[PDB]
DNA sequence: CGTGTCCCTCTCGGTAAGTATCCTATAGGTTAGACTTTAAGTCAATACTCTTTTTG
DNA sequence: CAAAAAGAGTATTGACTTAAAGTCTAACCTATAGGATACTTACAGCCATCGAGAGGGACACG
């Protein structure tokens, strides 16, 4: 500026931080997907928590969860497909659509 | 509503302990484990706490006694 | 968490422990794909990943691989914020000295080896050799050689002789020394020497050696071997938009260090000739010394900007370092600015906040309230409802600001009323609305000012804003217990105009039935607001046991005063509004409501005054015109007479009757006297211009002139702003400071011509160039006052003391400048204040003297009261609550916890912008004497043979009214114990005569008198008397210099006349230049004169008193009491010897010969009494007269500055600063304690150390109190963090590192910097709880 | 101008300068003295930890406010960590001990 | 062997824009681009079993 | 109530396409070495003009 006060380093912002508006949306999505999965069968609330790494470590593929339940690879793809089919229906998807 | 807090100060002295007691009571009423001892008139928990301080139904010893009673009740209901 | 912060030197092993790898290359990033190259300043395998939970190559890229290390690139998979925490290190190829421990003025490296810095810089520059344990054969250990001398020694000794060069030699010297052996040898050598300078030098070196032994440090850690590097995110290389980067200067400095280190390793591997290697070592030593502190040694390295690049030490120091710019004050969320306007409809607990501003400050509070109501499904839906400003988010906004205060702060925060909490009112607009009554506290007018609002978030910050910082709690000033919400200018003109009387107005003399009828008459136009009527008012006096008692009477008043009586509350008398009610009568009307009624009635009453003063100032229609400035009709004659009196002294200058310096003072004296005739002709014309008719006959009255009323009521005007509109502007000063002869005889109604308008600009730019930098010397004094006293807090309730300060009214010599009531109100008495009927006391010995107890002291006329003071408090680490007194802006006593050291420094530093022969009695009283010896003079009156006689005037009430100082040798025209009348001269003396008056009668003999050596021939050619003047030491002969001329009194019978009481001879040693007038053999009378010996700033004065500056010509005090004598002369300094009667006699001082003495070699001098005259040093008052006399001196010499500008500051706030100055001590007798002799230990530390010993059977150490300035007592503290954030960061961190200092975080700066609760207010209970569970 | 939450600086994680980059108001040293002259120890602590510099605490406070709970978890400012690293990158060893 | 004086030093109160520098030849590392392989997601048909409906 | 028939859930096999690597080759950066008329001490930023106070170090004298 027209003074010895302002420097170039005072105007460079940190772009690696996430906004608390975006950070409080994540804590709201982890709770919205927690009630929804609780409304499913315990078999489909466990294959969805494994096909997507929800509240745990690394997600698994279709075959890797086949050994977990002894079911074949193809049926789990259909078990997951029906679990996906249930959640698309209304009365269980109204709040989820507000996150897009 | 509030304009001056002189009555609460002459009830609970030192003008700095009043802030602590009122904040403790207002936090008790805010995270809604408790309900006010005074008729609320759209006042926030801060003003309700100060009004309870003024009337003498809430101070540090009252809060401590109620907390100890709650701790005894939780132990006796543990089963 | 942590309880303390410890600082010390770092070993190379410690530096290698901090580091996560070695930085081996100067590279930062790849120029094509901007990835951090290995392994340079920005390295991913040393300092961590650049992206969250990702490798550098990309083999591992998710949180499933957290903590694993890539086998390809070695980058650990973790968070990218570890680049702010991970350090590296540079392994230097040669040892390098640390510039802080070498180039600091004490020079720890230099004084640890007892080697001068000039002789160490020669070794570090590779231009001299120094031996390192060369054996006891030919050379000493630290003996310096040269190239030739080392060559000769090498040719004479091929072994048992090691002499190196560079920092390796210094490191070997530091490593080969044994600290305990050196310390014990220095201790043995200390006792042998008696020279003070050698003792001080040895004590300094022993202190350093003990500091090194006690701490874990080692001497050779001051020479760097491993250099740590900063984490990369603290010296970033972020790109701007446009393909260009922005870098820190630390990158440049580190790259230079690494380049020179790598080249040095290359040269060492190449077996280069030693000149090249020495040059490279010098260059490496330069590069490191510019990284740590640039510009300290040599010249500052500059970058491509042609500016010196900022080093590591420049990021910590200064007004823009880490401490002052980022730790003591920050940028803050939930805040915004706007321009302020009036909004006079508000109540003083509320402000006006724009809807646009309040929608952004309270943004999270609305996002969390829409979902609670179900109005928004998610946080993203509520973010868009307030983004388009739906009609329902304004109903939500009113709910989140109901009882939620906001903090309004104006940019210069001079005192704590610059931040106050208000309850927002949502207004449509973009300007904040600020209540009119709070503008005086902020010092804010509405001509472009701005304010910042801050939103308290947590539930405890909303209760501190409401209970502590609310605007209805701050109605008294914390500096003096006086109101701060006084009505200012438009409301004080509406209450003055309403409460006034006119001689014959509408409805005069009619009898009204009450205040409500007086308003029905005025509103309907049946009566005038100034109409003398009889109303019937009912007033309540609560002189019962708190109960109001009514009394109804028919009062003689006006209509306007009856209408105002409907506003005044119950317990106030009617005479509070039965006057003209200027500005002072309204400020005391609110003060006699806070004392009688309390806070809640006063807050309501303060708004009703504002509403009824704004309303009746508008109905007044008070304007300003050009006919309101009434020029006197005699102004053309007064000036024409003064222009004909300078034309007669102009003639006398040409006729030689007056010199140049006399006509200049005879023209100013008649232009400054004709300026007081114009200004008395208009003011006697303005003030009573209204002459009107009563009952037909005319009758004069006070004027209703529109400009007189604005000055008579205190509503924005004075009598000096007038007389420049209707009189004349008088004498102007040229910039040199002289006063111009001819004044400017015009005003602002007639107009100034070109020549006399140019003159009135020298004094207009000078007045504007002062206030443009008076704020820089006043904002720096108040910064040093805070930092010396920020750690002082009321930590107790009653320390049980009997010491105190005797409070007396201030009498400069004439009128009482400060009565006893102002100096004693709200302070705890130390002893029982017994009444003059001494058979019974008046008040007890612990009563807080409030307004009622200060009435008894005024009725009974108590001369003096002893009160407990802060400076005499027994509390260690804090102040007792009774040794402070009234809360001062709370009517009660001070609360336990309250931070009184910051209140007392803002109170002194806020008014800093406003700052720059004979005795004739006045009243009828009794002449009083004190500390005076009496003897009859020749004429039968009383002459004085004392040096510190005080003259007083005791009236019938027994209190002192006047105080005059009587010099030595003065004739008293009256006698002691007599009741004299006013205007009578009771003392007269010759100011230019220093008499040597006798005490008895007899003959005068010229003993030891020599003509030609001592006496000269001075024959009077006017009267014929013989004048015989002695000569000085510079002229008297050497053989006669050792002779003292004396006049021993004898008689005519050969006997000896002696002074009564004792049997010593009555001899008077005549000093030089003594005029022997009376001839020998003449019988004299008692007390006969023998000889006639011939003879600051406003704002800097306050700074000099607190900084304890020594005056240019200090007055010499008497070190010990007894009898004075004389001794051998010398060239420059005379000799004065003071002999105690039974103590150690041979004490002596070197008085300079060119200073006028004041003791005639035979007087009984008292301890702490002046020998010479002049400005008295503050240090000598403390040593000789004690602690109570050095604090009386400062609070009386600094209130003189403030009382000359009409500034009221309590004496509590100056005695708090004095207490923080005499905070150290020096040991005199070590006793059975652990303190060294010359050590300067804290007073409180040596007060409890010899308290256990005295409670035990041992004996305690004695000490001497030490006085320090505010910039030296704030820099010598027990905490290195409250001192490094103030000043001299380099000098404080250097001493704290070599001593291993530990910070206990006991003050208010340490807890602010580290981010926790200050131990002062609401956080005082938290810190007391911690000190219980700690060391439980 | 008005701000609740925006962009923060790079080295010291503090809000930026006014109204050009949506910056906060400077709560300087004299305002700190003014808050110390009262007993406002909690207001000061939220001024210098949660509102300004503590990275975890400000996100926690935002979530608390949008969850209807007004409570602070202060922590230690990042500027003090920067200061410790800068003093430590000289030869001096400064540390927090308990 | 010790004070007084003078001198040296330390600390306090959008930017930026130029300085010529050359040139040639080897050998190795790096990337990027396409071909090929493989674990992975997908669909079509199906048999069995359970449920649900329909009917007298 | 009880038996026959149809719709749906659950678990399979055989292709059938698809994204993610794995690998080979080339082409293009990038680090390193070498150059033989004779050449031999840079400067300039203390190119600056503030004051005001405190501290230390060296000189000279009593
Ligand atoms: C001068 C003014 C500040 C007001 C004083 C304006 C005008 C040009 C602006 C900067 C430049 O664009 C470069 C840079 C771009 C990066 O992306 C980061 C921001 C930077 C610092 C910009 C912020 C700032 O606003 C600047 C300094
Ligand atoms: Mg203004
Ligand atoms: Zn990797
Ligand atoms: Zn005390």
Q: What is the CATH number of the domain that holds C727?
A: 1.10.132.30
Q: At what angle do helices C1099-1106 and C774-789 cross, to 10 degrees?
A: 20
| Residue C645 phi, psi (nearest 5) | -100, -15
Question: Kind of pairing, strands C805-807 and C865-867?
Answer: antiparallel
Beta carbons of C1327 and C1307 less than 8 angstroms apart: no
Beta carbons of C966 and C931 less than 8 angstroms apart: no
d(CA C293, CA C311): 6
Beta carbons of A23 and D59 less than 8 angstroms apart: yes
Beta carbons of C237 and C42 less than 8 angstroms apart: yes
For CA atoms C1259, C1261, C1265, C1270, give the dihedral sign.
negative
Q: Determine if ligand 1 sits within 6 Å of the CB of residue C240.
A: yes
- Residue B79 contacts by C-beta under 8 Å, 6 or more apart in sequence? none
A97 is in an annotated binding site: yes
Residues paired with residue C452 on neighbouring β-strands, in sequence order: C337, C409
- Residue C1174 contacts by C-beta under 8 Å, 6 or more apart in sequence? C1111, C1113, C1114, C1115
Longest dimension (CA), chain B: 49
**What's the 3-state SS for C1173-1187?**
CCCCCHHHHHHHHCH
Reduced to 3 states (helix: H, G, I; strand: E, B; else coil), residue C1152 is strand
Instruction: Check CB contact of B21 with chain C, cutoff 8 Å.
Output: no
Return the structure tokens found at C214: 């006690």
Task: Give distance in angstroms: CA of C1330 to centre of ligand 1.
Answer: 47
Beta carbons of D71 and B27 less than 8 angstroms apart: yes
Q: Which of C153, C160, C213 is nearest to C183 (CA)?
A: C213
Return the structure tokens found at D84: 């410790």
Using left for φ > 0, alpha for ψ between -120 and 50, and beta otherwise, residue C74 falls in: left
Reduced to 3 states (helix: H, G, I; strand: E, B; else coil), residue C966 is strand
Angle at C972 between CA C971 and CA C976, to 5 degrees: 150
d(CA C603, CA C608): 9
**Runs of H (alpha helix) within chain D:** 29-37, 41-45, 55-66, 78-88
Return the structure tokens found at C775: 């704020």
Angle at D71 between CA D69 and CA D76, to 5 degrees: 145
CA distance D62 to chain B (A): 16
**What's the 3-state SS for C754-774?**
HHHHHHCCHHHHHHHHHCCCH
Beta carbons of C342 and C431 less than 8 angstroms apart: no
Reduced to 3 states (helix: H, G, I; strand: E, B; else coil), residue C841 is strand
Beta carbons of C938 and C997 less than 8 angstroms apart: no
- Residue C540 contacts by C-beta under 8 Å, 6 or more apart in sequence? C548, C549, C550, C551, C570, C571, C572
Return the structure tokens found at C386: 């307030």
Whether C771 sits with its Cβ under 7 A from any strand F atom: the answer reads no
- List the single residue in B with minimal CA-CA distance to D71: B27
CA distance A57 to chain D (A): 23
| Residue C670 phi, psi (nearest 5) | -105, -10
Reduced to 3 states (helix: H, G, I; strand: E, B; else coil), residue C1033 is coil
Interatomic distance A76 CA / F14 C1' (Å): 18
Question: Kind of pairing, strands C19-22 and C87-97?
Answer: parallel
Beta carbons of C810 and C817 less than 8 angstroms apart: yes
Return the structure tokens found at C1130: 């010398």
Whether C51 sits with its Cβ under 7 A from any strand E atom: the answer reads no
Find where tokens 């160490």 sit: C120
Find where tokens 């096909």 sit: A51
Return the structure tokens found at C190: 């200390």
d(CA D75, CA C664): 73
Q: Which of C786, C796, C785, C787 is nearest to C878 (CA)?
A: C796
Measured CA to CA in angstroms, residue C858 lies from C708, C817, C852, C915 at distances of 37, 17, 10, 32
Residue C20 DSSP code: E
Please tell me the total count of domains within chain B. Answer: 1
**What's the 3-state SS for C813-874?**
CCCEEECHHHHHCCCEECCCEECCCCCCEEECCCCECCCCHHHHHHHCCCCCEEECCHHHCC
Residues paired with residue C226 on neighbouring β-strands, in sequence order: C91
For C1169, half-sphere exposure in the C-beta direction (CA atoms, 13 angstrom radius) is: 19
Give the closest ligand to the alpha carbon of residue C245.
Answer: 1
Cα dihedral C672, C678, C681, C682, rounded to 10, equals -120
Task: Give distance in angstroms: CA of C514 to centre of ligand 3.
Answer: 95
Q: Which of C617, C670, C375 is nearest to C491 (CA)?
A: C617
Residues paired with residue D72 on neighbouring β-strands, in sequence order: none
**Runs of H (alpha helix) within C715-852:** 754-759, 762-770, 774-789, 820-824
| Residue C433 phi, psi (nearest 5) | -105, 120
Q: Is the preceding omega at residue C424 within 30 degrees of 0, hence cis?
A: no
- Residue C984 contacts by C-beta under 8 Å, 6 or more apart in sequence? C921, C973, C974
| Residue C75 phi, psi (nearest 5) | -80, 125
Which range marks the domain in which residue C757 is found? 634-765
d(CA C1299, CA A94): 67
Beta carbons of C710 and C725 less than 8 angstroms apart: no
Burial of residue C364, with CB atoms counted within 10 A of its CB: 0-12 exposed, 13-18 middle, 19 or more buried:
buried
Measured CA to CA in angstroms, residue C663 lies from C290, C669, C673, C719 at distances of 66, 10, 15, 30
Rg of chain B on CA atoms, in Å: 13
- Residue C471 contacts by C-beta under 8 Å, 6 or more apart in sequence? C348, C349, C420, C421, C422, C435, C438
Q: Determine if ligand 1 sits within 6 Å of the CB of residue A11.
A: yes
Measured CA to CA in angstroms, residue C1199 lies from C822, C900, C1193 at distances of 13, 19, 10
Chains A and B touch (3+ CB pairs under 8 A): no
Reduced to 3 states (helix: H, G, I; strand: E, B; else coil), residue C1049 is coil
Say how many residues make up chain D.
98
Instruction: Check CB contact of D7 with chain A, cutoff 8 Å.
Output: yes
Residues paired with residue C1242 on neighbouring β-strands, in sequence order: C1224
How many CB atoms sit inside 10 A of residue C271's CB?
7
Find where tokens 């003050």 sit: C1307
Measured CA to CA in angstroms, residue C826 lies from C481, C591, C887 at distances of 9, 15, 8
Beta carbons of C117 and C110 less than 8 angstroms apart: yes
d(CA C1277, CA C1261): 22
Residues of chain D contacting C230 with CB distance shorter than 8 Å = 85-86, 89
Q: Closest residue (by CA) to atom 26 of ligand 1?
A: A11
Return the structure tokens found at C547: 């109960």
Strand F footprint nucleotides (protein C-beta < 7 Å): 10-14, 29-30, 46, 53-56, 58, 61-62
CB-based burial, C965-986: b 16+ in 10 Å, e otherwise: ebbbbbbbbbeeeeebeeeeeb
Q: Which of C569, C579, C412, C428 is nearest to C495 (CA)?
A: C579
Instruction: Check CB contact of B39 with chain C, cutoff 8 Å.
Output: no
Return the structure tokens found at C413: 């925060």
Q: Which of C643, C382, C607, C332 is nearest to C487 (CA)?
A: C607
Q: At what angle do helices C900-909 and D29-37 cross, to 10 degrees?
A: 120
Q: Which helix (H) or strand (E) holds C109?
A: helix C108-112
Q: Which helix (H) or strand (E) holds C205?
A: helix C196-214
d(CA C1017, CA C1030): 10
| Residue C640 phi, psi (nearest 5) | -65, -30
For CA atoms C109, C111, C115, C120, give the dihedral sign.
positive
d(CA D35, CA C416): 7
**What's the 3-state SS for C392-460?**
CHHHHHHHHCCCCCEEEEECCCCCHHHEEEEEEEEECCCCEECCHHHHHHHCCCCCCCEEEEECCCCCC
For C280, half-sphere exposure in the C-beta direction (CA atoms, 13 angstrom radius) is: 20
Residue B2 DSSP code: -
Say how many residues make up chain A.
100
Which range marks the domain in which residue B57 is found? 1-79
Ligand 2 (ion): which residues have CB within 5 A?
Answer: C 445, 447, 449
């Amino acid at each position: 500026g027209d003074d010895e006060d302002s420097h170039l380093g005072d105007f460079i912002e940190d772009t690696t931080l996430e906004l608390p508006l975006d950070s409080a949306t994540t804590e709201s999505l982890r709770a919205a997907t927690h009630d929804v999965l609780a409304g499913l069968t315990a078999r489909e609330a466990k294959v969805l928590r494994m096909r997507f790494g929800i509240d745990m470590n690394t997600d698994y593929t279709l075959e890797e969860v086949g050994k977990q339940f002894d079911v074949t690879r193809e049926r789990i793809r259909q078990i997951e497909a029906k679990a996906l089919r249930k959640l698309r229906h209304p009365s269980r998807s109204e709040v989820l659509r507000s996150f897009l | 509503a509030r304009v001056t807090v002189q009555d609460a100060v002459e009830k609970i002295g030192n003008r700095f302990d009043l802030v602590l007691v009122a904040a403790r009571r207002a936090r008790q009423m805010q995270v809604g484990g408790k309900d006010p001892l005074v008729p609320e008139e759209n006042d926030k928990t801060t003003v309700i706490a100060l009004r309870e301080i003024e009337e003498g139904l809430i101070n540090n010893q009252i809060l401590d006694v109620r907390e100890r009673q709650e701790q005894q009740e939780q132990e006796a209901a543990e089963l | 968490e942590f309880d303390a912060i410890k600082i010390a030197l770092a070993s190379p092993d410690m530096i290698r422990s901090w580091s996560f790898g070695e930085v081996k290359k100067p590279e930062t990033i790849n120029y094509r794909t901007f990835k951090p190259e290995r392994d340079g300043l920005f390295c991913a395998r040393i300092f961590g990943p650049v992206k969250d939970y990702e490798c550098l190559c990309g083999k591992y890229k998710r949180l499933k691989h957290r903590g694993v290390i890539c086998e390809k690139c070695g980058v650990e998979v973790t968070q990218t914020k570890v680049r702010r925490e991970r350090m590296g290190h540079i392994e230097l190829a040669s040892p390098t000295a640390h510039i802080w421990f070498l180039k600091s003025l004490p020079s720890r490296i230099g004084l640890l080896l007892d080697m001068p810095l000039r002789d160490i810089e020669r070794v570090l520059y590779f231009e001299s050799y120094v031996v390192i344990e060369g054996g006891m054969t030919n050379l000493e250990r630290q003996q310096i050689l040269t190239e030739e001398q080392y060559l000769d020694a090498l040719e004479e000794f091929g072994d048992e002789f090691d002499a190196k060069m560079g920092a390796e030699a210094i490191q070997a010297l530091l490593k080969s020394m044994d600290l305990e052996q050196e310390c014990e040898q220095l201790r043995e050598e200390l006792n042998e020497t008696n020279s003070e300078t050698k003792r001080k030098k040895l004590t300094k070196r022993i202190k350093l050696l003990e500091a090194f032994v006690q701490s874990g440090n080692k001497p050779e850690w001051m020479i760097l071997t491993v250099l740590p590097v900063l984490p990369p995110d603290l010296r970033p290389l972020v790109p701007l938009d446009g393909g260009r980067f922005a870098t820190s200067d630390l990158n440049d400095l580190y790259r230079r260090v690494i380049n020179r280190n790598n080249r040095l390793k290359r040269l060492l591997d190449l077996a280069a000739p030693d000149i090249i290697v020495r040059n490279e070592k010098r260059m490496l030593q330069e590069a490191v010394d510019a990284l740590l502190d640039n510009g300290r040694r040599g010249r500052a390295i500059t970058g491509s900007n042609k500016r010196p690049l900022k080093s590591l030490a420049d990021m910590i120091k200064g007004k823009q370092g880490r401490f002052r710019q980022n730790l003591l004050g920050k940028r803050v969320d939930y805040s915004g600015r706007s321009v302020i306007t009036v909004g006079p409809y508000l109540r003083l607990h509320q402000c006006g906040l724009p809807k646009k501003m309040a929608l952004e400050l309270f943004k999270p509070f609305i996002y969390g309230k829409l979902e609670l109501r179900g109005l928004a499904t998610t946080i993203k839906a509520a973010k868009k409802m307030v983004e388009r400003e739906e009609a329902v988010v304004w109903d939500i906004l009113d709910e989140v600001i109901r009882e939620h205060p906001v903090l309004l702060n104006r940019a210069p925060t001079l005192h704590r009323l610059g931040i106050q909490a208000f309850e927002p009112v949502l207004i449509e607009g973009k300007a904040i609305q600020l209540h009119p009554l709070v503008c005086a506290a902020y010092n804010a007018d509405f001509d472009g000012d701005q304010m910042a609002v801050h939103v308290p978030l947590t539930l405890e910050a909303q209760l501190e804003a409401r209970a502590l910082m609310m605007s209805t709690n701050n109605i008294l000033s914390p500096a003096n217990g006086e109101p701060i919400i006084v009505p200012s200018q438009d409301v004080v003109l509406g209450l003055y105009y309403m409460t006034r009387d006119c001689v014959n107005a509408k409805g005069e003399g009619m009898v009204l039935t009450g205040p409500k009828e007086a308003e029905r008459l005025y509103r309907s136009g049946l009566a005038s607001l100034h109409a003398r009527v009889k109303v019937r008012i009912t007033e309540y006096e609560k002189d019962a046991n708190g109960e109001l008692v009514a009394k109804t009477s028919l009062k003689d008043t006006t209509v306007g005063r009856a209408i105002l009586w409907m506003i005044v509350p119950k317990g106030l008398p009617y005479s509070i509004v039965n006057q003209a009610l200027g500005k002072k009568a309204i400020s005391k009307m609110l003060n006699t409501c806070y004392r009688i009624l309390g806070l809640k009635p006063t807050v309501i009453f303060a708004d009703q005054i504002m509403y009824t003063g704004f309303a009746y100032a508008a109905r007044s229609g008070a304007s300003v015109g050009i006919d309101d400035m009434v020029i006197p009709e005699k102004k053309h004659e007064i000036i024409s007479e003064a222009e004909a009196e300078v034309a007669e002294i102009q003639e006398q200058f040409q006729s030689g009757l007056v010199t140049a310096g006399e006509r200049y003072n005879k023209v100013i004296d008649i232009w400054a006297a004709a300026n007081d005739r114009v200004s008395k002709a208009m003011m006697d014309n303005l003030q009573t211009e209204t002459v009107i008719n009563r009952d037909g006959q005319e009758e004069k009255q006070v004027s209703f002139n529109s400009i007189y009323m604005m000055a008579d009521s205190g509503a924005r005007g004075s009598a000096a702003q007038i007389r420049q509109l209707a009189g004349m502007r008088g004498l102007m000063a040229k910039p040199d400071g002289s006063i111009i002869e001819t004044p400017i005889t015009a005003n602002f109604r007639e107009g100034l011509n070109v020549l006399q308008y140019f003159i009135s600009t020298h004094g207009a730019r000078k007045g504007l160039a002062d206030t443009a930098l008076k704020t820089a010397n006043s904002g720096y004094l108040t910064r040093r006052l805070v930092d010396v006293a920020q750690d002082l807090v009321v930590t107790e309730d009653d320390c049980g003391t009997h010491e105190g300060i005797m409070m007396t009214p201030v009498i400069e010599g004439g009128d009482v400048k400060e009565p006893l009531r102002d100096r004693v109100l709200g302070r705890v008495t130390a002893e029982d204040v017994l009444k003059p009927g001494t058979a019974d006391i008046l008040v007890p010995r612990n009563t807080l003297l409030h307004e009622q107890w200060c009435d008894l002291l005024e009725e009974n006329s108590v001369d003096a009261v002893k009160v407990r003071s802060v400076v005499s408090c027994d509390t260690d680490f804090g102040v007792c609550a009774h040794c402070y007194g009234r809360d001062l802006a709370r009517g009660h006593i001070i609360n336990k916890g309250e931070a009184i050291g910051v209140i007392a420094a803002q109170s002194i530093g806020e008014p800093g912008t406003q700052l720059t022969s004979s005795i004739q009695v006045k009243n009828k009283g009794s002449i009083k004497l004190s500390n005076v010896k009496s003897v009859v003079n020749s004429s039968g009156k009383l002459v004085i043979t004392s040096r510190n006689t005080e003259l007083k005037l005791i009236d019938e009430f027994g209190r002192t009214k006047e105080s005059y100082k009587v010099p030595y040798g003065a004739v008293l025209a009256k006698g002691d114990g007599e009741q004299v009348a006013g205007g009578e001269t009771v003392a007269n003396w010759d100011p230019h005569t220093m008499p040597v008056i006798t005490e008895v009668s007899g003959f005068v003999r010229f003993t030891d008198m020599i003509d030609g050596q001592t006496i000269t021939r001075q024959t009077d050619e006017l009267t014929g008397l013989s004048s015989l003047v002695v000569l000085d030491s510079a002229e008297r002969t050497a053989g006669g210099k050792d002779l003292r001329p004396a006049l021993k009194i004898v008689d005519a019978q050969g006997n000896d006349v002696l002074i009564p009481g004792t049997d010593m001879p009555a001899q008077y040693f005549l000093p030089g230049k003594a005029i022997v007038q009376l001839e020998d053999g003449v019988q004299i009378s008692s007390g006969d004169t023998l000889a006639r010996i011939p003879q600051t700033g406003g704002l800097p004065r306050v700074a000099d008193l607190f900084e304890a500056r020594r005056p240019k010509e200090p007055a010499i005090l008497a070190e010990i009491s007894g009898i004075v004598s004389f001794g051998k002369e010398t060239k420059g300094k005379r000799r004065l010897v003071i002999t105690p009667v039974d103590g150690s006699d041979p004490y002596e001082e070197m008085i300079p010969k060119w200073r006028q003495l004041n003791v005639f070699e035979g007087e009984r001098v008292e301890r702490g009494d002046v020998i010479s005259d002049g400005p008295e040093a503050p240090h000598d008052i403390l040593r000789l007269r004690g602690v109570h006399a050095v604090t009386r001196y400062i609070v009386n010499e600094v209130q003189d500055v403030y009382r000359l500008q009409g500034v009221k500051i309590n004496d509590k706030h100056i005695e708090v600063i004095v207490r923080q100055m005499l905070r150290k001590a020096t040991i005199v007798n070590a006793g059975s304690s652990d303190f060294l002799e010359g050590e300067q230990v804290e007073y409180s530390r040596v007060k409890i150390a010899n308290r256990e010993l005295e409670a035990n059977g041992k004996v305690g150490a004695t000490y001497s109190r030490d006085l320090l300035g505010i910039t030296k007592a704030s820099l010598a503290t027990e905490s290195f963090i409250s001192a490094a954030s103030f000043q001299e960061t380099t000098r404080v961190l250097t001493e704290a590192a070599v001593a291993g200092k530990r910070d206990e975080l006991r003050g208010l700066k340490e807890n602010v910097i580290v981010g926790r609760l200050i131990p002062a207010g609401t956080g005082y209970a938290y810190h007391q709880d911690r000190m219980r569970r700690r060391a439980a | 101008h008005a701000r609740s939450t925006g962009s923060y600086s790079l080295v010291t994680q503090q809000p930026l300068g006014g109204k050009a980059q949506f910056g906060g108001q400077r709560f300087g040293e004299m305002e700190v003295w003014a808050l110390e002259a009262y007993g406002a120890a909690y207001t000061l602590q939220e001024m210098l930890t949660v509102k300004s510099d503590d990275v975890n605490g400000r996100t926690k406070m935002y979530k608390n406010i949008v969850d209807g709970n007004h409570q602070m978890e202060p922590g230690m400012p990042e500027s003090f960590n920067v200061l410790l690293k800068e003093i430590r990158s000289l030869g001096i060893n400064i540390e927090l001990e308990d």
